[PDB]
């Protein structure tokens, strides 16, 4: 059922993806690379004292604080959902091999018994109503670009000046490029305007993953992560194999002379993709105004900040169901891309812009190095983009694509299983829009708070409440999938956007509280995804600009966890045993140094200003800007702090671009 074409790096089709510069050529050729991360300045992830510390601490905390999760996946008591063995990885050393990305997810969806389009007219109206509500009365804003981010295919530039030029040029030439694509002239659009080509596959670490201790043997077991070989990826699973990647770290002693303590493993590696910047810039110019609309008008469902902000909504509910979606990005349906595009055309959006948007979600993928002696292959033909990868992580609107799919998927689940009396309110497009507008503002007896694949579904008192309880029971039983669209289950230890919903003896939302996840504190402090990048002079360009700052926001973020104090004492005791030093003093010194360094980057901050004007969100984001890509948004961060991490193209250039895209 159609194997995707594949081209080696030597092929002209792959060569055309990399510009005639050292950075682009190095990216094309880069072989498999691995190494210990510099966890903190002058400390490697594989340091014997650090691994001794991790062994003692993970064992102690699991022993003294076993998980408190009930039969319905509700967290209670200590606020712990699993063991603390997730920290036991040799950070910087990945599992081998990483997966080859699936060129087509059509068979994957069909075999999982998931729909190839909207099941009913009601569902079709709801998905289309979501497009009309999300993309309608948008306001232009400056196009913000992350400092130090790559432009990927074809230039691979990390320079802000070059990035601004590329983005401004892209906004000027998007119409001409989109019109060429409408004529089927993809090669011309790419050659002239660098809009097309492929996504560049980057493999990212998921630093902590499940590890269990087998009581029978006293030996640790890592969670098996299934990977697809090249044959499986190109055939969409028709041929080739899906097998467990090797997390065995024994190899590090032989290859690198690194001592590997018992029960320490190689890290899980996830595919991530970087988009061709010239294609992403015109998409981002529309995506940011869309986020501003949904986070303002539909703030109830979509805008999530603090644990108390979430708590105020959830406390009003009679029932709260914390859902889980299996492999969201790979299962994301191409028919939704086509439905979105069709509806934007119906609204009066520029056909050339819709074509660029459509193309961004069908683009080929360049596979770098999943393992030693593997990769350097382009999947799909850039002359006619036709891939069905699901949702590409580096696309300019991925968060919105996951949010649109999932928000409607959950609403449909609530309609099907709990509220058939509301079906009469969804008769046509105007009534579908009126109903969805009301639902998204939290005005109906069925409610939700969501972001992509993370959500909490609510029921107030009323006719739907009884159905709500049956749906929860169906999820607990786990025999029937409640959705025709995605694989839905209940979360084992309900949480929403990093905050655990802590229930009491009553097991009711009214008396439940949102608390920080203590395991996330440990993940962030002892298993960061990236090293400190001490060689990158401009700190704002680093993946972890100011790691020391997270100590100042720790109490605000995690202080509400029942075992907060216990964990900090256990850390201090174990760090003393391992290093013969105070961890608290070590972090206080790092906090002082990073606070001083920060003033160099903030115009409003004098030579030794201090953190007085900064919020806990500001501090968490300066230590980890990745939180700005999955947890928070621009409006949640102080203006002077957002400027440290991002730079923009003028609103004058974006305003003119947006006028040409949008309906009359
Ligand atoms: Mg899952
Ligand atoms: Mg959830």
In a domain, 97, yes or no: no
Among all ligands shown, which has an atom nearest to the Cα of 326? 1
| CATH code for the domain in which residue 617 is found | 6.20.410.10
Closest of 189, 163, 199 to residue 17, by C-alpha: 199
In a domain, 340, yes or no: yes
Q: Are residues 309 and 355 in the same domain?
A: no
Query: Is 453 marked as a binding-site residue?
Result: yes
Q: Are residues 186 and 109 in the same domain?
A: yes
CA 488 to centroid of ligand 1, rounded, Å: 8
CA 80 to centroid of ligand 2, rounded, Å: 15
Among all ligands shown, which has an atom nearest to the Cα of 491? 2
316 token code pair: 């009003």
What order do you get walking across the sheet with 488-490 strand by strand? 446-451, 454-459, 319-325, 488-490
d(CA 13, CA 428): 46
- Tell me the three-class secondary structure of 266-326, residue by residue: EEEEEEEEECCHHHHHHHHHHHHHHHHHHHHCCHHHHCCCCHHHHHHHHCCCCEEEEEEEC
Closest of 466, 480, 490, 350 to residue 418, by C-alpha: 466
Name every residue whose Cβ is closer than 8 Å to that of residue 397 and which is 6 or more positions away in sequence: 283, 284, 286, 287, 290, 357
Among all ligands shown, which has an atom nearest to the Cα of 329? 1
In a domain, 357, yes or no: yes
d(CA 332, CA 335): 9
Q: Are residues 503 and 415 in the same domain?
A: yes
CA 497 to centroid of ligand 2, rounded, Å: 7
Q: Are 564 and 606 in contact (CB under 8 A)?
A: no
Count Cα neighbours of 421 within 13 Å in the Cβ-side half-sphere. Answer: 11
| CATH code for the domain in which residue 293 is found | 3.30.70.1600
CA 32 to centroid of ligand 2, rounded, Å: 34
Q: Are 181 and 356 in contact (CB under 8 A)?
A: yes
Q: Where a domain ends, among 397, 432, 452?
A: 397
CA 415 to centroid of ligand 2, rounded, Å: 20
Q: Are residues 591 and 612 in the same domain?
A: no
The beta-carbon contacts of 562-571 under 8 Å, at least 24 apart in sequence, are 562/77, 562/78, 562/79, 562/502, 562/515, 563/65, 563/78, 563/79, 563/80, 563/518, 564/516, 564/518, 566/64, 566/65, 567/61, 567/518, 567/521, 567/522, 570/57, 570/60, 570/61, 570/64, 571/57
Count Cα neighbours of 355 within 13 Å in the Cβ-side half-sphere. Answer: 20
Q: Are residues 271 and 360 in the same domain?
A: yes
CA 282 to centroid of ligand 1, rounded, Å: 33
d(CA 36, CA 643): 31
Q: Decide: helix, strand or coil at residue 550.
A: helix
- Length of the chain equals 664
Q: Are 76 and 68 in contact (CB under 8 A)?
A: yes
Among all ligands shown, which has an atom nearest to the Cα of 325? 1
Closest of 472, 336, 342 to residue 406, by C-alpha: 336
| CATH code for the domain in which residue 578 is found | 1.10.490.60
Q: Where a domain ends, among 364, 397, 430?
A: 397
Q: Are 497 and 627 in contact (CB under 8 A)?
A: no
Among all ligands shown, which has an atom nearest to the Cα of 496? 2
Report the DSSP pairing between strands 89-94 and 265-274: parallel
CA 161 to centroid of ligand 1, rounded, Å: 41
Residue ranges of alpha helices (H) inside 65-215 are 106-111, 121-135, 160-182, 186-193
Q: Are residues 312 and 413 in the same domain?
A: yes
CA 399 to centroid of ligand 2, rounded, Å: 16
- The angle that helices 518-526 and 48-64 make with each other, rounded to 10 degrees, is 170
Q: Where a domain ends, among 564, 581, 606?
A: 606
Model resolution, angstroms: 2.9
In a domain, 523, yes or no: yes
In a domain, 251, yes or no: yes
Closest of 478, 479, 476 to residue 507, by C-alpha: 476
Q: Are 116 and 626 in contact (CB under 8 A)?
A: no
CA 98 to centroid of ligand 2, rounded, Å: 26
Closest of 412, 502, 391 to residue 457, by C-alpha: 412
Report the DSSP pairing between strands 43-44 and 38-40: antiparallel
Q: Which residues pair with 633 in a beta bridge?
A: none
Distance (Å) of CA 595 to CA 371, 542, 591: 40, 16, 6
Report the DSSP pairing between strands 6-8 and 377-379: antiparallel
d(CA 520, CA 514): 14
CA 173 to centroid of ligand 2, rounded, Å: 41
CA 133 to centroid of ligand 2, rounded, Å: 24
CA 192 to centroid of ligand 2, rounded, Å: 44
Last residue before each gap in the chain (C to N over 2.5 A): none
Query: Is 35 marked as a binding-site residue?
Result: no
Tokens 């309880």 identify what position? 469
Among all ligands shown, which has an atom nearest to the Cα of 500? 2
Q: Are residues 66 and 156 in the same domain?
A: no
Tokens 């305007």 identify what position? 193
Phi, psi of 620 (to 5 degrees): -60, -40
How were these coordinates obtained?
Answer: X-ray
Sign of CA dihedral 428, 431, 437, 441: negative
Among all ligands shown, which has an atom nearest to the Cα of 487? 1
Among all ligands shown, which has an atom nearest to the Cα of 486? 1
Q: Are residues 177 and 53 in the same domain?
A: no
Distance (Å) of CA 353 to CA 286, 348, 350, 372: 10, 11, 5, 40
CA 186 to centroid of ligand 2, rounded, Å: 40
Q: Are residues 392 and 286 in the same domain?
A: no
Residues within 5 A (CB) of ion ligand 1: 324, 326
Domain count, the chain: 4
Report the DSSP pairing between strands 242-244 and 226-228: antiparallel
Name every residue whose Cβ is closer than 8 Å to that of residue 640 and which is 6 or more positions away in sequence: 602, 603, 604, 605, 613
Element (H, E) at 144: strand 143-146
d(CA 390, CA 104): 8
Name every residue whose Cβ is closer than 8 Å to that of residue 143 and which is 6 or more positions away in sequence: 167, 171, 281, 284, 285, 288, 648, 649, 653, 654
Among all ligands shown, which has an atom nearest to the Cα of 323? 2
CA 491 to centroid of ligand 1, rounded, Å: 8
CA 453 to centroid of ligand 1, rounded, Å: 9
CA 495 to centroid of ligand 2, rounded, Å: 5
CA 602 to centroid of ligand 2, rounded, Å: 35
Q: Are residues 339 and 440 in the same domain?
A: no
d(CA 370, CA 269): 9
Give the domain range for residue 408. Answer: 277-332+398-517
In a domain, 407, yes or no: yes
Q: Are 321 and 471 in contact (CB under 8 A)?
A: yes
Q: Are residues 367 and 493 in the same domain?
A: no
Tokens 């900040």 identify what position? 305
Residues within 5 A (CB) of ion ligand 2: 322, 454, 491
Where in 460-531 does DSSP place strands (E)?
A: 488-490, 495-496, 499-502, 513-516
d(CA 242, CA 621): 37
Query: Is 530 marked as a binding-site residue?
Result: no
In a domain, 96, yes or no: no
Q: Are residues 132 and 183 in the same domain?
A: yes
In a domain, 586, yes or no: yes
């Amino acid at each position: 059922p159609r194997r995707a074409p594949a081209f080696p790096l030597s092929d002209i089709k792959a060569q055309m993806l990399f510009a005639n510069n050292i950075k682009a050529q190095q990216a094309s050729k880069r072989s498999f690379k691995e190494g210990a991360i510099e966890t903190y300045e002058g400390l490697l992830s594989v340091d014997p004292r650090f691994l001794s510390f991790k062994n003692e601490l993970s064992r102690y905390l699991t022993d003294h604080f076993p998980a408190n999760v009930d039969e319905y996946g509700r967290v209670y008591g200590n606020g712990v959902r699993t063991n603390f063995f997730g920290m036991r990885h040799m950070n910087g050393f990945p599992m081998i091999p990483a997966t080859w990305p699936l060129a087509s997810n059509l068979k994957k969806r069909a075999d999982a018994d998931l729909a190839d389009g909207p099941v009913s007219e009601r569902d079709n109206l709801l998905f289309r109503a979501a497009v009309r509500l999300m993309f309608s009365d948008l306001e232009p804003v400056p196009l913000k670009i992350r400092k130090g981010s790559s432009t990927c295919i074809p230039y691979f530039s990390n320079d802000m000046g070059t990035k601004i030029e590329i983005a401004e040029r892209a906004l000027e030439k998007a119409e001409e490029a989109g019109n060429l694509m409408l004529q089927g002239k993809f090669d011309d659009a790419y050659q002239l305007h660098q809009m097309g080509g492929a996504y560049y596959v980057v493999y990212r670490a998921q630093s902590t993953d499940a590890i269990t201790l087998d009581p029978k043997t006293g030996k640790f077991v890592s969670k098996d992560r299934m990977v697809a070989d090249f044959e499986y990826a190109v055939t969409g699973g028709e041929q080739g194999s899906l097998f467990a990647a090797s997390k065995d770290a024994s190899r590090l002693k032989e290859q690198y002379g690194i001592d590997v303590p018992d029960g320490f493993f190689c890290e899980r590696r996830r595919t991530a993709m970087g988009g061709p910047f010239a294609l992403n810039a015109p998409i981002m110019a529309v995506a940011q105004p869309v986020r501003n609309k949904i986070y303002s008008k539909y703030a109830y469902t979509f805008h999530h900040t603090t644990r108390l902000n979430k708590e105020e909504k959830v406390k009003e509910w009679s029932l709260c169901v914390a859902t889980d979606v299996s492999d969201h990005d790979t299962f994301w349906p191409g028919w939704l891309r086509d439905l979105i595009c069709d509806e934007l055309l119906n609204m009066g959006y520029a056909p050339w812009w819709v074509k660029l948007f459509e193309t961004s979600l069908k683009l080929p993928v360049y596979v770098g190095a999943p393992a030693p002696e593997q990769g350097h292959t382009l999947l799909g033909d850039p002359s006619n983009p036709d891939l069905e990868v699901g949702l590409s992580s580096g696309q300019g609107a991925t968060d919105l694509m996951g949010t649109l799919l999932m928000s409607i998927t959950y609403l449909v689940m609530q309609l099907d299983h709990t509220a058939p009396h509301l079906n009469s309110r969804i008769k046509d497009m105007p009534s579908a829009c009126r109903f969805l507008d009301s639902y998204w503002q939290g005005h109906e007896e069925i409610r939700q708070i969501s972001k992509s694949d993370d959500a909490m579904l609510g029921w107030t008192k009323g006719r739907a409440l009884v159905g709500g309880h049956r749906l929860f029971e169906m999820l607990k039983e786990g025999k029937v999938n409640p959705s025709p669209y995605m694989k839905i289950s209940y979360e084992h230890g309900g949480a929403f956007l990093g905050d655990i919903l802590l229930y009491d003896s009553r097991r009711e939302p009214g008396s439940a509280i949102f608390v920080g996840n203590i395991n996330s504190m440990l993940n962030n402090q002892f298993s960061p995804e990236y090293g400190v990048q001490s060689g990158v002079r401009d700190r704002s360009k680093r993946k972890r600009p100011f790691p020391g700052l997270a100590w100042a926001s720790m109490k605000d973020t995690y202080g509400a966890c029942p075992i907060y104090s216990d964990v900090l004492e256990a850390i201090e005791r174990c760090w003393w045993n391992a290093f013969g030093e105070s961890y608290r003093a070590y972090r206080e010194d790092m906090l002082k140094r990073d606070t001083l360094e920060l003033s160099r980057y903030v115009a409003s901050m004098a030579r030794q200003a201090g953190l007085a004007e900064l919020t806990p969100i500001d501090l968490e984001v300066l230590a980890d800007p990745n939180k700005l890509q999955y947890k928070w948004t621009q409006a949640d961060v102080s203006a002077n702090i957002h400027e440290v991490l991002m730079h923009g193209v003028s609103v004058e250039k974006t305003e003119r671009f947006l006028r040409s895209v949008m309906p009359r």
